[PDB]
Structures are given as structure tokens and as C-alpha cells.
Amino acid sequence: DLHYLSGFGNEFASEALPGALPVGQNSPQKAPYGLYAELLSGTAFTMARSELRRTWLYRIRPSALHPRFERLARQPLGGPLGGINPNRLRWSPQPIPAEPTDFIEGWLPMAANAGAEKPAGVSIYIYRANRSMERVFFNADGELLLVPEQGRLRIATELGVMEVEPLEIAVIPRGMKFRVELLDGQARGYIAENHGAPLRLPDLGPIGSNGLANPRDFLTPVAHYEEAEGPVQLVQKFLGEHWACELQHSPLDVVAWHGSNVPYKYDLRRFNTIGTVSFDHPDPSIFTVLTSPTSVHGMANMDFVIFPPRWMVAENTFRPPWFHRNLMNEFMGLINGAYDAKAEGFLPGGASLHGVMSAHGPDAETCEKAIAADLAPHKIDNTMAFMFETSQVLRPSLQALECPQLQADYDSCWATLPSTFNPNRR
Amino acid sequence: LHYLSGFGNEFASEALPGALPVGQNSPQKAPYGLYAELLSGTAFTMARSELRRTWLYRIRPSALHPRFERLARQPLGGPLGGINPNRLRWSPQPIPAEPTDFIEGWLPMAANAGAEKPAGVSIYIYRANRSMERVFFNADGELLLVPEQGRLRIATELGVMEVEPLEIAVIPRGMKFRVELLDGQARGYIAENHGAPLRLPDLGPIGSNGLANPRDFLTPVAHYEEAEGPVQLVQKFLGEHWACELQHSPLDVVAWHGSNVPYKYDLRRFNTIGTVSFDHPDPSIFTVLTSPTSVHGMANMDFVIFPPRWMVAENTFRPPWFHRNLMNEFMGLINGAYDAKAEGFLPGGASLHGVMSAHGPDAETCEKAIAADLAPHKIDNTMAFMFETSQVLRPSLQALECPQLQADYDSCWATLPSTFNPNRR
Amino acid sequence: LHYLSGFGNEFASEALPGALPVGQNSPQKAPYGLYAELLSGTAFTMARSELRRTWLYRIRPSALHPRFERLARQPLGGPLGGINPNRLRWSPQPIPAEPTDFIEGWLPMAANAGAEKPAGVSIYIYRANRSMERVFFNADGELLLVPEQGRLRIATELGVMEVEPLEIAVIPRGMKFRVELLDGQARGYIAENHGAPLRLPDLGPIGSNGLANPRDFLTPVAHYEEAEGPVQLVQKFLGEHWACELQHSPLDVVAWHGSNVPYKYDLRRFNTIGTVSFDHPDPSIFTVLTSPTSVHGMANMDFVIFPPRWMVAENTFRPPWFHRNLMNEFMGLINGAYDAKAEGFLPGGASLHGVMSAHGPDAETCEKAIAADLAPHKIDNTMAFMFETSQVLRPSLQALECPQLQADYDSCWATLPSTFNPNRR
Amino acid sequence: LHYLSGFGNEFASEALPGALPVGQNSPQKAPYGLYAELLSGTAFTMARSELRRTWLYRIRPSALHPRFERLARQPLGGPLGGINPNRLRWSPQPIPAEPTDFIEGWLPMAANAGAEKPAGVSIYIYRANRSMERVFFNADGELLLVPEQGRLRIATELGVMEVEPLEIAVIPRGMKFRVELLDGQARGYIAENHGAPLRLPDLGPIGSNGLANPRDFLTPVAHYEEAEGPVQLVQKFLGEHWACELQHSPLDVVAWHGSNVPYKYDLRRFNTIGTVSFDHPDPSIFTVLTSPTSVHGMANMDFVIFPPRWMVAENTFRPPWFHRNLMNEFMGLINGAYDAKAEGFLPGGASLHGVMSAHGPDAETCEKAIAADLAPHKIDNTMAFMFETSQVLRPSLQALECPQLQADYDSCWATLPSTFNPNRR
């Protein structure tokens, strides 16, 4: 049923009725089908064209037709930041709550660059839901990157419907209205809420003009509108708060649209993974799928990086990640299988945080196997881990620090590292 | 009053002949026994196009002052309002009965940050009923002033300028000035720019002429005062008023040269660019002045106007399109009526449409425009404007409790009908 | 003929279902037994916004060809003309009698450099009376086509597009095509771009919409030929036509994806921006496409048009102002009449005003515009354009020797009167 | 021989203790009575990342020389060849019988410009059968040397380095050196860079390690000659050899410090990056050194290698894709065989595929690569490379008439079969 349009960054055009898009202009005095033209400006008007995101919508009712928004009683993001804590942290998977919880009600704040009330940089959540949304929602605080881990989602957006399963990702532009339906009854996955410059493909450098995530594989849904008359709740997230009003129509009433500010999805199984074909262990920036820049050239707001099935051929090399201390902040999760660097304790749905200059690296067991291994071409398979790497430090929420799922002795995973130093034998 | 023209020029003005040193900035014995002082409006190391600095030749160094002390009267110390995503509209602000000079009468409307940590832009509406009997400088930012009622006579260190409704003036951060109310009372708007100084927009395809022409930006000529007697010196620092008493007038600059200057501009001289075919151009096209960030293309704020202009778009919906925006749109009105809003938006009024809030023409403007007979139409007798900021503008507590805040703004859109017919393109 | 819309898109098109490999570019065994081939329009390492590259899935690789040999017929061999700083105007070019297909009919008009050392821009007028019975590619640059008389049907590697006067078309460097004349004969203008590929201008204050809207740029859908038999393949290299003989059609691309594409654009769809107040905006404001240099702001060439448009400027001299320009202004005319010239400038004609040559409205146009009663006037039924280049344009020997070159173009300004009266402001 | 390590370092080396002035560059009385001399490899005002300058402390200043005089023997005086778009391949070059030292033996293969107006890049193959009994510098550009047969002992102003096949060496413009042939004869390739100095490529997502690691670039330590006796000093200027005679050694630098240095690099140390999944990455991914232009992303030339490497791409056509390129591809071979060409391409040989020429794997390689059953495979015992330039490479007349030019290179692609079946995905 669902068709998609391909090509990251494209000026797309889609209409659900023939000729619904005005021809040769954006704002006819009398629009086709008696629709209303509406502009969704995702960026300042004066961005360089390469950075412009904006979409013209031709819709049954203007978005401006809504009564006063009011603050909902139920607020999942109102918990305070946790205390200062430099420790290396790891969480076991999050259980799905018993009480009714839809997609937006189910975000568990893990760690963020700032407090919810003054969004900046990145905010990280784990979502757990057991109901489809019976309302429509937009996020005024940022762009959303969704990384499903358990259960498929059907995401009905203003520009059309997309379905996403684990091993795929989805991105929803700031301000865009959507409704998240659960195809498998319940769902769990990771969210990076990006409050800065929109995610986009990394500069490829010497990799050139193809590879990593190829832009042909980024898919955007085709136009689709609803005509359901009767009360519909519109919720927006603003400064961390859920506010709502009630409409008497469906706000997913866009019959046609054209432009570049679009929801999209991507299948990580399609990543054109580049790595070493010789020796050593490349910097994990080499696995970058999407990135959000800052005004500081080369220092991202965040990089979305993956660790996929891949060939390991490095000769005479310590193949797992090197022991590491980073200016950046490293938040990892796991979609399936096991991650190469950690023998036990890092499960799908789990998470780790190694903040600025925290000493990390492969655990004792992994290290021991790696040095002893007899090296031949080896394909890592049946796994997908990822990282949200942020320039700003990630402060864990109080909820996360108080989480029963917060493992108590993560530090022990390094505790048995032996000295093997012998100044007498090079 | 005489003026020097040319936005961004290296000016030179002297109130006494030869008062400027010739061929250097720092003579050992300066003409007329004046003191050389440097006002660095930017870091020393800015590229030359970004540099703002003025050399002052003055009777007493600004360094001659006793300790500043916090004033009890603090117009800008009120809290920030609570979180509120709603579309907001305010009726004109009445002028207070209590004695209130220019600096005492800034009503905080909305700001990117709390007054104690200035960042981005702070927006105010000023109301005053007294001329200033003292001198003031703002350590927190550059001031953009947009008079709505009443003329201002502004005595600055670099000289005197007068501004009336339909003109704007800008006072650089740290520059001392004193505001006289020529008409007894005054009301207008203020954008306080805590970021990169306002400048002319990059014209892109518009090229090398158009919009605000640089020849129209006017700076006053040198004028000094020789009052001996106690003068209060007030500064705004991190939101607070602090003061000391001097025994001389700090407006004692006999000559100056450089680029860091106060200036004025008559909005009636704007070379308005628009469509000459069809459709409705983005309102960035009406940009008068802009403050950039380190992110190319994304301003700290754009100052944009909606002036008398020709509407000629054919087969077009001529009023603004329905819109949702990353940026934050604060609109004011200097005179007349604005084309997007039939009623409720008056001179001295304000509207705030925050990031991604759904806005556009009201139901009435909509009906009329679709049924209108398209033909060249001169919009006249109006002047609206917008301060557009990239950071969200947080309404102050005062603005949210304001009797002038309209209770039923959302109702102006309430009667928009569905006209959809799936069976008729 | 179907098209794909959106300037600069990563497009994907297949003439057979699933002819595009899914999830990769280079399968070991490609669908349908096709061959993968990459056309790199730019260096691999360009920033993504500047990247132009298309993947092709074709019956035979382009590498399957015998040695190229120089043809005896060389339309572009003529030398550069002598040095001449004068203002030049040519009448329309007659179509020659002898058989002349599209590539045989380019009359070199003016160019930044000799044809054997391509640089900047080379300008031609094409005259043809035969469809091509061969396939062609230009190794020297991107081709901007501006038809003036006659429809073209252009069969490219990526598919077929048809172009008529008032439309333009661009064929990327190195891409193979064949031109069929739908009307028996054809005439038009060519800008051959040896520099950075043409693209949409930065809009500055115009914002995110306007001028040439990206949705209006159309790219053909995949289309392949299967005619076996002998086919001549010609390439232009350093000004010369070289050819080889193939035993298959080189237009055998069954599927493709990417961003290095031919496209067309309808100039009637141009969202024309201009003055809605007074004065006369810089003609850069009419920019459709632009080729930049490494010097920001200074294009290799701007392609600018002068379309139907409302003139409403008040108390203004509305025709172009008198002008001297660093840049070099080559004008053509697709239909109608141009606003700055009253006689002598006809469809298919050309004018050249080089670096610092004094140009402006002719005496007749000037006289009328000063005397006119001013009111809203719609310029209609006309399309002029300009190729504006930063490097000087050297007229060819053929152009300087042309019978179509007018002998007394200077005379059109000869009657400009003084009207200066120092006693009457 | 000892070396200092780290591409782009501020190095410091002295052959006598304390010969480098401490804490300054220009003492009034320098240690040991030496002369200070600055070698400015770049403009003074380059950003520091781009700066190359070396301070020398030497026995006599370089200014002590008689007038230079044009040599009668001119190795590079032959003209450019005619225009020729064809794909070209040459067999290895024989070494001439006549006495020919390093600089006498450069055979021009292809260049962006005629020797008299150096621009971009010039490519040569050197053949020599004598060591130099004289000293040489190149005013026209930086030299990248790629030995293929025979070892070199290169005495430079900054010290002595030894280079063998599989290593490269770079000598900065203007620096003096003398080449000794350790094996009696030598043959190899040269890229003469007339533009921005070669440097490490921006790594992009590869990040902060990989490709050529900076620690592996080695520079010789100070070494001076005290001999008095006749020495000929030759320079290449605008393509011509000019010489004067000294009665002392110009390799008399006792101490030096700075960043403008000769260096060498072992290609066997290249941290090769490639696909660990599928497809065939752009060969830019093999970049060792690059020379930029003012156009970001578009190199003057990239130096790229094809080294021993693991081939794991699954369900993939593993050899280079068929290709047409804006850029110009000159390939060479140091040892073994290159993956894309079954026969005809030997160590010492060369290919040129110019802008938009159709290239790709030969029919033999292609056929085999489609049929092979894929498994992990280490390509080994090979080293090829490419000089890829943005400007077109014109082959010299010498190279076009060279007996070693292969008469039927096009034949290698002539047996490419159609395998298209439109009725079978």
C-alpha cells in the first residue's frame, strides 16, 4: 500500500488528487480543490539553499484554526536533571509500563545537554508505549530521530504515512504534526531530540561522492489526508511541556505538498560500510549515518553513528575499539545482537554513557580474546549497535540515575585488566 | 541639526576647528588640551568590515567617576513569565501616571533570556512622561529604537539627533546618551541587541542598491556640553540600573572619528522590493537591518518593515500565506493598519507568534482576498514591522499579566471555513 | 514525454521494472545483464551541495568504442577577432543553405578565450536545417540552450526532452545527446560554460521562494534505443570535432540515478521580483541561473532575463539607468522588444557592451521616459536576456566580419541632448 | 642516515652544537660566523596551517653567485603535442645511451600548460644513467618523485635522504639538491606541482587517523659540505635550464629550522581504507597527498595509490566501475599488475584518460569479475598510482611520437559483449 519518494534533501512534490498542486506558482488566489496554501518554514528564510528546509502544504483547513492551547496535567518530561556525576554508566533494557502509555507519554529522559525547559543541543530518551496515539502531536523544541528496537511503528504525518521497524530509522522535522500507531501492540526504542541544526549527511572527505549512507535510500512518504469529522486532540511539546487544544477536524488534512522539509526513513541494512582493508582500527566517525553540525567547523552538535555487520580483515592488529578518552560524549545503545566491545551486560534496549574524558575501552574479557586471537578475515554479523556522540556533556536525568535498571558495578567490567609489561622483552 | 551620512563610514567630526589630531590618534599634547579616549565596540581583531571603534577627544576621561551603586528603582527586575506556547496579542500600552523617564519606562515584553544573563535579543515597549535629567549607557547591548508616539531629542556623546515616528535610531552599546521628550510624552518599541551589531542585509540578487540605501543612514555632528554641577550617570549592567554622581557633564566630547556611531534612518526612504508578477514574497525581503549569528544565514534578529507598497500579483492570494516558522515573530505597528489583521491590532499594539505556532491572515482578511478583483493596488498610510528572532522569545511575567493582553486572540481565526471539494479541481 | 521535477535532486528513473540495483550501485551481476557506469560531473571530493554525479545502467559501456579521429569539417576553428572595445550589435542570423545539423551550426559570437584553451564562457548562435543523424558529447563544458525559433527534440542519455522558444535547456558536460528539429529548421543562442556548473542563485533577502522556483526544473525519464547498425559518435574537445563509429546506439541507458542531469525550464514560470516603490533595481535581480567562481560574489556568468513584468516605480526614470560595468554584458532577444532600445534590436539579434563601455537607453527611449506620465504599466509579450560574464568577451573573427554586424550602433545615442540648467534645481 | 618525523612539523636540526641561534632568528653575530637566510616557501601572510618557511644558517649566502646563463642543452624545450582526446597508453621507457643525469633525463609526458607558462601540474618520466656532478633547483614548482627502478641518494640543502621504489620524496620549490644514482641507472615518475603545496587530505569521516599517517613522513637532518672548488648551479625557470658556476658548495647549511622541508614516505605504511561491506569506493579514498585550488573540493591534483589490499565486497563488481570523469586521470605503475588491466600496463608504463573519456576495466577483467565466485581476497604484490588533475593534461609532442606509445589501446575494450535481456531481470 505505502509508496515512498527517494533522495535525501530533495525538492519533492506529491499530490493525492490530480492537479491539487498549483502549477507554476505557490499561492494562487483560488487554489485547486478550494484548498488552503500553508508554508512550513523549517529554517530561517535566508539560509544558503543547501541548508534550506521548507515545505508548501495545500490543505483542507489552515493550521491557524485552533483554540487556545492548555497545559496537560500529565507531563512525562518534567523530572529534574540528576546530580553531577562523572561516572561511566550502563543501563539494562527498560521494561514497558503496565499503565496505558502512548508514544509521546512514554519517553523516558535518559540524558540531555540542558534542562527540558531550555532545550539546547541534544536530548536523549528511551520510549516505551503500549497504546496507539488517539491524537496528533508536534514537537516545537526540535527535530526527532527515532531508532526502533522492539516493535514496528506506523507514523502518520502531515505529508503522508510511513512504517518503520527495528534496523530502520525515522526522522520527523520540528513542528510537523504526526500520530504514532503501534503495529505490534507495544513498542520500545531510542530517541535523539535534536534542538540544533537539522541532521544531514556527513561530508564524505576522501570517501568522495558515494558510500556510507547513500542518499537514494532515504525515503519520504507520499501525500495522504484524512477527513474524519469530530473532536481530535492536538498536543504540542513546548519547552519540555505537553500543551493541548481540541479541534473539530483532523489536522492531517494535507491533500498535496511540495518542498524539502520532510519526514523520512532509512534502512540501516543498506549502509555502505567503509572500514580498514589493511591494518589498525578506524575512528568510529567512519560509521556516521547522519550528523548535526555546529557553527564550529568539524565539531558536531551530534553524530549518529552505527556499528553494523561488517568484515574485519585488519592484520597484526588489535581489532576491537582501542582504549579511549574523548572530548566528546558517548551514548551507545543496541538494536540487536551483541556489541563487539562488551562481553556481558550490554543488551538490546540497554545503554551506556561515557562522558567527557572518562576512560573507556573494551572490557577485560574482550581484550583478552582479541590479543590471543589468530587473525583471519572475519565477518561480524547479526548485530546492530549505535552511538549518539554529542559535543556538549550529557547530564543524566534524576529518573535515570534512580532507575532500577542502572547497573551498580559497571566499573568491574574493566577490573581484571592485567599488566603484561616486560621492560626486558620488546 | 546637521548630520553625516553613510552607514558604516569612518566618520570624522570636530566641534572646534583642528580639535581632531592630524595624522595620529594619540598625540602627547592633544589640541585644546583634550583627552584621547578609545571606544572599542568590538574585539580589536575583527575583520575590518566588522570593526566598530570610535576615537573621542574629550574634556574629562570617562574614567573620572566615583564607585557605581545599585539604584532602588529597578524597571527590569521582574521575573520571566511561565512557559506559554500560545499566540499572543497586546493592545497599546497606556502611559504611566507616576513620573517616568525614558530608561525608567521600558516595559519588558519578551526576551531570549533573563535580564541578568543577556543573550540574543530583549524586546521592550517604552512609555515615558519625563525628559531625562541625567545620562545613561547600556553595558548590555546595542539599542534599536522605534518611536510610535512622540518625538525624541537624543543627546549622545557624538552629538544630537532627533527621531520621530516612522524613523528609527540605534545607540551603540556603552555609548552615553540622554533622551528629551519634545512632545511631553513618548511611546515606542525597543529591540535590545545583545549579539553582533545590527548591519545592512546581504542583498543577494538585489545586488548593489535597494532596500535601505546606505546614503540614508545619518549620524549627528560633534556637540559638547560644559555644565559644571552634579550630574547622575546611570548604566544598565546585567539588567540592573547602577549609578554614580559626576561633577561635570559626560557629554563633553569636542571631537571624534571612527565607525562606532549612533545613527537614525527614515523608514519612508526604504526602496521596497516586491513581486512584480505573482505570489507573495517571503517577508525577509523587507529587511531593514539584521544581527547575524555564527551560523551563516540564521540571524540573531532581523528588523523587517511592512511599508506603503504596490500590490500587483496576478492570480494570487495577496495577504501573507498561512505560516509556521522556526523563527519567532514579534510584530508591532507605528501607524495605520496591517494587511493581515482586520481588527484588534492598533498602533502601539504587539503580537507574538512563537516557534512553530500556526499563524496567518484572519478569517475576514481571507474571505476578502479570495473574492477580490486583482489589479494594481497601492497599500498606503501604514507602517508595521517585525522583530524576528531565532531564539524563542519568553514573554515577561508583566506582559502575561498585562491588562492589555487580549483574552481571545485565537478567535480571529475561528471562523475559517472548509471550502474543499474533492470533485472539482 | 514525462519529466521529473526539482532542481538538484537525487533522481531515480528506470525504463524497465527493477532495472535499478536496490541497496547498492555496483552489483556483481546487474539487473537485465546491464553494465554499471558512473558519470562524475565534478571532482569526487566536492562538498555534497556541489556534487554532480549520475549512475547509469546501460546495454554497452561507453568505453566500447574505436579510436576517435579528427573531422575535416570544423565549425569552431575560426580565430578570435582583433581587439575592439566598441559597442556591438548584430541583426538576426540567417540559416545557411548547405546541410547543417545542430552541432554543425554554431556560429562563434564571443568568448573569454580561444576555443583550443577553453575557459570561462563561450557564446554562440546556432543555425540548423537538418536533424542530427549521429550522437554528440561536449568534453569542453556544460551547454545552456536558449531556443529563439523552432522546437527541439533532444534525445539524451537520460531520456528525451522537447524545448521551444521561451524555454531553456541545459546539457551537462560529457553527456551524449542528439538533436532533432521538429520544425525543419532552428535558431537560438548557446552559453557554453567551461567553469563551475550553473545553479540557482543565493536569494539573499528574497529568502526561500521566488525567481526561478526549483519545482519548475524538469528532467526527462529514462529512455533507451536498441537500433543496431552503424552510428557516428562525435565529441567536441578543445574546440575540435572528433568522431568514431559505433555498431550500436550510445543512447542505451535503461536505468539511472543521481544528480548530473539534463533539464529544461519554462521562463514563463519565473517569479519576477522588482521594485514596488521607486527606482530601478539592479538587473542581477532577474537572475535565473548562475555559474560562480572561487571569488565570492563574482560569477563566471549570470544568466538573466527580462520578462513580462509590472512597472510601478513612482517619480522614477523607469528604463535602465546609464551604466558602465566591470562585467561584460551580452544580450539576446527571444521575442518581442527590449525596454532600453527602440529600434535595431530584434529577436535573434545580439548586443555586446564590454568592460567599462558606456551604455544605457538609446536617445528615443530616454526622451520618452523622462516625459511620461507615470502609472502602473504591465510590460508584456517580450523576453530578452543577458549572458553576463566576469572575463572579457572577445568577438570572433567571423562575428567581426559578419554582414549582420550593424555599422552605426553608436548613432542610437548620438542625439542625447543636454538639459542642464545650473539655475533651476 | 637519520631522519626527523612528522608531516608539517616545525623541525630543528644542527650539525654543530649550538649552531642554531637560541631564542631568535637573526643574531647580529651568528654562531660559528654563519649567515642567516630565510627560505619563504609561501607568502608571508598565509594562515599558519598553510605556512612553509625555513631559516638557514649557512657558510655563504645563496646571493653569492654570478649571473645565470641559459644552457645550450634544453631537455624540456619540445612543444605540446596536437589536440588529441584519445585514450592513451605507453609502454615502459628505455634508458638512453647518452650520458644523462637526473635533471637531463626528464621526459615530458603530459602537462596542464606549456613549459614556458607553468600552471597546475606537469608530468614527467625520468631516465638517467649518471649521478649529478652539479646542484639544481626548480623555481617552477614543488617536485613529487616516484621511483620505479633504481635507488636515489638525494643530497638537499637540509640534509641527505635515500629513496627507493615504493617510497616517494618531495622537494620544495627553490630548494637545492643533487641526485646520486645508487644502482647506476634509474627510472621513475615525477609530478611537478606549480600550485598550492602538496599536503595531507582532509579526512572527513575517516577522522583523525588513517590513510597516510603524519608520523611516517621523514625529513633528513642537517648536513653541510665545506669543499671549495668549481660547482655548477642549475635552475629550472619557466621550463628552461639556466646555470652559473660557483667556487663553493651550495649545500653548505650547517643548521636550520622550520617547516619548508624535503621529505620522504614509505607507501607500504599507508593505512588503506576501503569497503568492508559492498560496492567499490571512489579512488579518492586512496589519497596520499593533495594540492588544493581556491575552489573547495576541487584539487589541482590528487596523488592516489592502489596498494596491497583486502577485497571483501559481497555481491559486487569488484574492479573499478566503467567511468567518465570531469578530472584527468594519469596512471603509473611501480610494481606488479593493476587490477583493471589484464595486459599492456607494465611497471614504468602509463595511461592517460582525459576529461570525459570513457574508461573502465578491460573486457578480460570485466568478464572474469562478473563470473567469479566471491570470497575475501588479498590483492598483493602490486603498487600502482594516479596523478589526477583538474586541468586537462596535454601530452607533449615527444610523448605523442614516442615509439613506446601503444598503437591500439582502444582494442582492450573492443570485445565487450552485450548481455542485455529486456525480458529477464
Ligand SMILES: O=C(O)Cc1cc(O)ccc1O
Ligand atoms: O566501543 C565504544 O565504547 C565506542 C568506540 C568505538 C570505536 O570503534 C572506537 C572507540 C570507541 O570508544
Ligand SMILES: O=C(O)Cc1cc(O)ccc1O
Ligand atoms: O503577517 C504576519 O503575521 C507576518 C508575515 C508576513 C509575511 O509577509 C508573510 C508571512 C507572515 O507570517
Ligand SMILES: O=C(O)Cc1cc(O)ccc1O
Ligand atoms: O539595458 C541593458 O543594456 C541592460 C541593463 C538592464 C538594466 O535593468 C540595468 C542596466 C543595464 O545595463
Ligand SMILES: O=C(O)Cc1cc(O)ccc1O
Ligand atoms: O582503473 C582506473 O583507470 C582508475 C579508477 C580506479 C577506481 O578505483 C575507480 C575508477 C577508476 O577510473
Ligand SMILES: [Fe+3]
Ligand atoms: Fe570512545
Ligand SMILES: [Fe+3]
Ligand atoms: Fe510568519
Ligand SMILES: [Fe+3]
Ligand atoms: Fe549594464
Ligand SMILES: [Fe+3]
Ligand atoms: Fe576513472
